Design a protein around this ligand. Sequence first.
Ligand SMILES: *[C@@H]1O[C@H](CO)[C@@H](O)[C@H](O)[C@H]1NC(C)=O
Ligand SMILES: *[C@@H]1O[C@H](CO)[C@@H](O)[C@H](O)[C@H]1NC(C)=O
Ligand SMILES: *[C@@H]1O[C@H](CO)[C@@H](O)[C@H](O)[C@H]1NC(C)=O
Ligand SMILES: *[C@@H]1O[C@H](CO)[C@@H](O)[C@H](O)[C@H]1NC(C)=O
Lengths: 40, 220, 49, 94, 223, 120, 49
Amino acid sequence: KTWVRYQETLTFENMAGVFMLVAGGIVAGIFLIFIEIAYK
Amino acid sequence: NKKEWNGMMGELLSGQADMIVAPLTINNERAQYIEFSKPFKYQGLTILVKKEDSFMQPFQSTLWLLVGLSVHVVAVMLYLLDRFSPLTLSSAMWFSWGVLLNSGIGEGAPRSFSARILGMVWAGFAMIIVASYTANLAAFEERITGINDPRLRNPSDKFIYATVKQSSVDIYFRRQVELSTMYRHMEKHNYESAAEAIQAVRDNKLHAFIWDSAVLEFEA
Amino acid sequence: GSPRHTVPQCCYGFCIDLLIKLARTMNFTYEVHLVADGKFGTQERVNNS
Amino acid sequence: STNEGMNVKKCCKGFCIDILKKLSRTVKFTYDLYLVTNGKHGKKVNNVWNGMIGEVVYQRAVMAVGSLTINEERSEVVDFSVPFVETGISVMVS
Amino acid sequence: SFTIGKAIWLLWGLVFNNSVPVQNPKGTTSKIMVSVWAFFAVIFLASYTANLAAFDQVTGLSDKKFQRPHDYSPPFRFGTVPNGSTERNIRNNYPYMHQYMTRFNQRGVEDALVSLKTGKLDAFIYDAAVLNYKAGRDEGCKLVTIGSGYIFATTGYGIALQKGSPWKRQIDLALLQFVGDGEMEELETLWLTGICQLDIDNMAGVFYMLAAAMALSLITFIW
Amino acid sequence: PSAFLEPFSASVWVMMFVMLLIVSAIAVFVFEYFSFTIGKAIWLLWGLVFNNSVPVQNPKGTTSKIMVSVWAFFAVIFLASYTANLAAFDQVTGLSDKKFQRPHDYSPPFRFGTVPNGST
Amino acid sequence: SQKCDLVTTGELFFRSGFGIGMRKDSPWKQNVSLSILKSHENGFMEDLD
Ligand SMILES: *[C@@H]1O[C@H](CO)[C@@H](O)[C@H](O)[C@H]1NC(C)=O
Ligand SMILES: *[C@@H]1O[C@H](CO)[C@@H](O)[C@H](O)[C@H]1NC(C)=O
Ligand SMILES: *[C@@H]1O[C@H](CO)[C@@H](O)[C@H](O)[C@H]1NC(C)=O
Ligand SMILES: *[C@@H]1O[C@H](CO)[C@@H](O)[C@H](O)[C@H]1NC(C)=O
């Protein structure tokens, strides 16, 4: 009784590649937007 | 060429000890040398472990290019129907990427007297594709469970199991002749005390540890 | 159900082929008649004695 | 139709053949290896064995160098050596 | 303002709500009907996702699947080999399991292997390490056992001699010499192996219905 | 299911504010190159997640609609991951259950007892 | 295998021996028993299954 009975989508490592590919897609989209602005 | 003992039995046979108040393990060698008493503790062994998404790149890239070529062909044939009526190309691309956008865009409605059917079928087609994608993403080994495991007979750098150096549990594992490979695995990671084993398993350096049951229940 | 209506019909199946195999092994014939009721049989008390 | 047959010579390799060759190197005896023609590993059908148990127990073979499982009936009819590998039972599924 | 006869596009664009503007609703009745139809579309999409969500096997020797697979809809079957010690191990363990094997009999080792490769067999009780070898030499790591023999019998092999053979002690000493120097580990390393969401028909049928939709759009375009 | 700390975990929220600041700076740069999206870009960017925002008239230079579509696809896959997190989030079958040995297969443990020194 | 609504339950007990109900002491029982044993030793139930 005194010893035995007496008791008392992670986005850290899994979605790291998710963050890397989303950031790469964002950088590619921003590059396409600035090329579209510099063209027209 | 004499076999001796050490620790508590090294002091008992040499006169530096008279009464061992300790969890002494009953086996063949210690019962024939010294006398035993009534066993007050009934306790067994157990294994201490550490029990604590194919989006685009692990997912196969055939249907993504298929949807891209599909929306390209849809935009081309809607632009050709806008040519053959029964910023034109920019508004056509805006409509074709705003139907698929599925969140809200500041647009209008193009002249679709013979093209509203294609737009409504493409809208339902895009939503049933993303619904099936959500469905089959939502619908879609650390434990050891004993000593009878051939995965531990062929270990690796992940299947790490050890025991206390110079222990009676190691004597019982050495006595059985079919436990040679696990003995050779545990002798490479010999640990002195139990607190060092707890510190090693806490810092993600271990994956299994043979230890008595009630002590780990108290630690749990 | 019926007072008296028993006609010659065709019997086959699993036990009939077993009996044909038994008649093929040892040289004997048979004669299949059907049971009247549809009960297996228990130890029933009769109304007399 | 009958028990007529011919003596076909065939080559053997593998794990138990390596065990047989290492026993022929260590103990230095001449092996008389032949495949069994009665059947599989063994099952007693009305005091009639078959396979390696039927060859060893009925005084037609001396020993079983090849792979042979251990149960109660084979511990009763003959005696085994020390174990060297843990090959239990499992279930292959699709 | 096209709700005279052309309400089909507006109505089935408000089913999925893919950001398709149509008109500015000034009537209260129209917005109430659109809100009720949108709530119906939301609960219909919830029922559709519930239908899509509702649409290791044996984890022990005392499992109910060995009795009957009634817990699930597809049934399975299994069997062992005749004239072997595995059947005697089953008869010593459970004669009920021997009668389960007697109902679902089979031919042999290679026949059960062909039945596993072609799909004519679900489960097959065999040895522990030999099925691991067959899984390792399997092309593509397909045939994988449930575990590797955790709470199974875990038996071993040996060398059987005659009762009273004087050559037994020398063979025992030779086997103790072969095991206790790493030679048996070399034999177990050399002569063993070490190698070992998506659907097809549904979007194909959706593609057939899409081809029918393109045919109907071509019919409405030519007339 | 009292409160969830799994998707954002108070570490990704800083990246949400950084992306809001970047989209606001891009909107200021486009408005300088060229309409309430000068300092109010938060309601226009984060408001397009729950697909009932007010339609804002995009410029004709094909600038805002591409990043709106990218953020819309990000919101769709974020809601898909949220539904997957919700989907991933009788007790005792009998004597054949693994709970009688140890309920370590599940998260909560339990306990049981009979009469002391009895026939049970 | 005929219909799609006949699924057996998990309960299966009283697994007795179904055979042939024979008469009393008679010399025409041993040959029948040898024929049944001849059916046991070969694949007589397997092909009928
Ligand atoms: C079968 O026919 C033979 C004919 O000689 C004879 O033994 C007997 O009449 C029959 N009995 C057996 C052996 O089935
Ligand atoms: C016996 O008497 C009962 C009526 O008490 C009747 O129904 C039955 O047919 C009779 N026959 C027997 C022996 O059961
Ligand atoms: C076992 O071996 C015998 C021959 O000894 C053979 O007739 C039988 O078919 C084999 N298997 C069975 C089903 O017992
Ligand atoms: C049939 O049974 C008799 C004993 O009643 C026996 O002597 C005879 O050999 C048996 N014949 C065959 C073919 O089994």
